[PDB]
Amino acid sequence: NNTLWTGPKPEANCIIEYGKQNPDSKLTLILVKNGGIVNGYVTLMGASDYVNTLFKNKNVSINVELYFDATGHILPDSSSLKTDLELKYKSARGFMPSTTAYPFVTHNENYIFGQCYYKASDGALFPLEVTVMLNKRLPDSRTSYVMTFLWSLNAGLAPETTQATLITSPFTFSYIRED
Amino acid sequence: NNTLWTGPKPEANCIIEYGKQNPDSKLTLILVKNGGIVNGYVTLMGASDYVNTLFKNKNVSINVELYFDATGHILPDSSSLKTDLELKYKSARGFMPSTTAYPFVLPTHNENYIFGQCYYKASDGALFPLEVTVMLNKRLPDSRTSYVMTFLWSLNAGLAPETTQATLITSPFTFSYIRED
Amino acid sequence: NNTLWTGPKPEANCIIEYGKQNPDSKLTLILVKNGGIVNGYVTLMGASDYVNTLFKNKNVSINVELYFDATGHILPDSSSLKTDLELKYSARGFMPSTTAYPFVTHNENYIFGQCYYKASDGALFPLEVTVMLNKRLPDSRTSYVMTFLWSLNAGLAPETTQATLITSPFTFSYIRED
Amino acid sequence: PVFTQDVFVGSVEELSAAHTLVMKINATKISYRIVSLEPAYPPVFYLNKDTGEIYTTSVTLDREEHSSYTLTVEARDQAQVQIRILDVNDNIPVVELEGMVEENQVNVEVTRIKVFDADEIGSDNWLANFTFASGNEGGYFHIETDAQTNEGIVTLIKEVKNLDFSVIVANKAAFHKSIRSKYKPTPIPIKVKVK
Incomplete structure (x- = not known):
């Protein structure tokens, strides 16, 4: 087995707002093993009012952090995902970002950049600058691998004027897996 | 069996210019069954005059529609790719986009679009950027198809990328989607 | 046996200082067999003064060429790498397709993309990646050619002091030859 | 040793590709070597020390930043080279x-x-x-x-x-x-x- 789903169509399991304890956004994360590297898939979908009114502004930031452990399971009390990643058919250490190619601390060799696109409700298209940052940091002593996300936007005009459901396009990345 | 070919370098099999019998453009589409997703590959190449005179204008849009069925073959009646896809070592449901993650709607819906970009090198070497909009299912056209996967290469430039006629070759675009089990 | 390594954290194995005999820069090249295509992974780290003072200028083009033979090993006397690629545990299956990327305009031999160079203060200056497959034979024992190009243009320099050249990882896919 | 000419005159195009041939100097083993550049803050040119072919390097040129160049070469066992940049x-x-x-x-x-x-x-x-x-x-x-x-x-x-x-x-x-x-x-x- 070589898949860590969140789900094909998941429920609300990711939080965004600094202060909330309820899940208010859905995060579709799929990691598959492919030889010596691991591919990626990420799609955040809004599931509240606060995530839907985020794109009234012209400069936003959507921070999602996933603090793993020494086996491969998400610690739900310190990360931003309140639901463990479960496999497809059936030790998930072989899916983590490697600590030899991406070591712990400068160190700009941990970042993975890219771009996804937000399609507005009026018909226009807006690009979002994805920053995927591997390990670089220890938030506690129990954490052994860190994989964070960030969906920045800097546009001139506002994308929306009222509430619309925030869905981002799929983003694909690759990293070197821990053996 | 984890490769869905169109050929490494096929003949003219796609159809642009709506209302035409014979094919006029080549199309390479490679779908690899990789775990829980499908790693795609698409590349256009012109094989007539009307597809080659497309980039004399600055606001053009190339549209390719594919309509699969429930067992996983391209219907050659109403789609654009008039050639059934083969395997590498010849059912093909395992490469199709899943209806759990990308479902059909019938009245908006924006969770089944994969936006990306390829580039067009012109006749003098200038790279023009094209916008690709892969749209999974979203719209059942008739009563025989089961999966819909459309492509759309779009260009909105400031100048014309060509003045004479040259071969319209686009860059290899690499996407990913969730597959049907 | 479906990964061609250089090592996840290698030593110096590439030469960008054109006319210097020792290796002075590190690149990771990982090519995995994935069905009918091959996924790509490339980035470039500098390990000398000349590479790290490249990005004090506005227009800089960095060139890396690889010349495989008919078997699949790197010829270490003409290519830009100086150490051949190693498997995880011949290597003809990772080489690009002759019938899909043929030898001779021919714009069908190219794969374009984009990576980013985060500066010493942080500004996200984008570099344009140009991957060119076979297209050219340099001699009579070369049989497969891969060529990268990191082309930067900018209104002002990314840095005024030497820090370290690290490009972002880049992902590409090409048809392989069985 | 002693060259075969006095002043080498060459030309190169702005924003050209890397390792493009600029010109070829020659003299009467012969080791060609750039010993001085009058604009010296980038290394813009590269003299092939075995055969004497001036190549461009990984940092590309700019006519609007600097109009022309002047570098004095030396052959060991000197002469001016004036390179004028062609505008695009x-x-x-x-x-x-x-x-x-x-x-x-x-x-x-x-x-x-x-x-x-x-x-x-x-x-x-x-x-x-x-x-x-x-x-x-x-x-x-x-x-x-x-x-x-x-x-x-x-x-x-x-x-x-x-x-x-x-x-x-x-x-x-x-x-x-x-x-x-x-x-x-x-x-x-x-x-x-x-x-």
Whole structure:
């Protein structure tokens, strides 16, 4: 087995707002093993009012952090995902970002950049600058691998004027897996 | 069996210019069954005059529609790719986009679009950027198809990328989607 | 046996200082067999003064060429790498397709993309990646050619002091030859 | 040792590819070596020390930053090399407006559209080729690039209301392959005033 789903169509399991304890956004994360590297898939979908009114502004930031452990399971009390990643058919250490190619601390060799696109409700298209940052940091002593996300936007005009459901396009990345 | 070919370098099999019998453009589409997703590959190449005179204008849009069925073959009646896809070592449901993650709607819906970009090198070497909009299912056209996967290469430039006629070759675009089990 | 390594954290194995005999820069090249295509992974780290003072200028083009033979090993006397690629545990299956990327305009031999160079203060200056497959034979024992190009243009320099050249990882896919 | 010439004269094109041949020096083993550069803050050129072919390197050139170069080579067991950079059109023209005409006056100048290119002065890469966008449907104004001072002269042809129009700036030659597909035509409007 070589898949860590969140789900094909998941429920609300990711939080965004600094202060909330309820899940208010859905995060579709799929990691598959492919030889010596691991591919990626990420799609955040809004599931509240606060995530839907985020794109009234012209400069936003959507921070999602996933603090793993020494086996491969998400610690739900310190990360931003309140639901463990479960496999497809059936030790998930072989899916983590490697600590030899991406070591712990400068160190700009941990970042993975890219771009996804937000399609507005009026018909226009807006690009979002994805920053995927591997390990670089220890938030506690129990954490052994860190994989964070960030969906920045800097546009001139506002994308929306009222509430619309925030869905981002799929983003694909690759990293070197821990053996 | 984890490769869905169109050929490494096929003949003219796609159809642009709506209302035409014979094919006029080549199309390479490679779908690899990789775990829980499908790693795609698409590349256009012109094989007539009307597809080659497309980039004399600055606001053009190339549209390719594919309509699969429930067992996983391209219907050659109403789609654009008039050639059934083969395997590498010849059912093909395992490469199709899943209806759990990308479902059909019938009245908006924006969770089944994969936006990306390829580039067009012109006749003098200038790279023009094209916008690709892969749209999974979203719209059942008739009563025989089961999966819909459309492509759309779009260009909105400031100048014309060509003045004479040259071969319209686009860059290899690499996407990913969730597959049907 | 479906990964061609250089090592996840290698030593110096590439030469960008054109006319210097020792290796002075590190690149990771990982090519995995994935069905009918091959996924790509490339980035470039500098390990000398000349590479790290490249990005004090506005227009800089960095060139890396690889010349495989008919078997699949790197010829270490003409290519830009100086150490051949190693498997995880011949290597003809990772080489690009002759019938899909043929030898001779021919714009069908190219794969374009984009990576980013985060500066010493942080500004996200984008570099344009140009991957060119076979297209050219340099001699009579070369049989497969891969060529990268990191082309930067900018209104002002990314840095005024030497820090370290690290490009972002880049992902590409090409048809392989069985 | 002693060369076969006195001053080597060469040329290279702006924004060329890496390891492009500039020129080939020669003399009467012979070890060619650049010993001095008069502009020295980038290493822009590279002399092949076995055969004497000046190549460009991984940092590419810029005519608008520095017009020409001068480097003195030395062959060991000296002579000047003056390399002049050939200009390409890698710079979009910009425009830094009002016009007052009278009733039915034929071939009277209106105003002068100023335009400030940054390429070589006197070529086709600095001469702004003015075209039209909207306003010459009835055939009213003819446009012209004055080659001495780079001005878009507009002058009545059919004599004659607030019949405004707009021009589009471009050069007389084609844009370079790194700057084309980034140029977008901005219609600069001009209001005329009849009396």
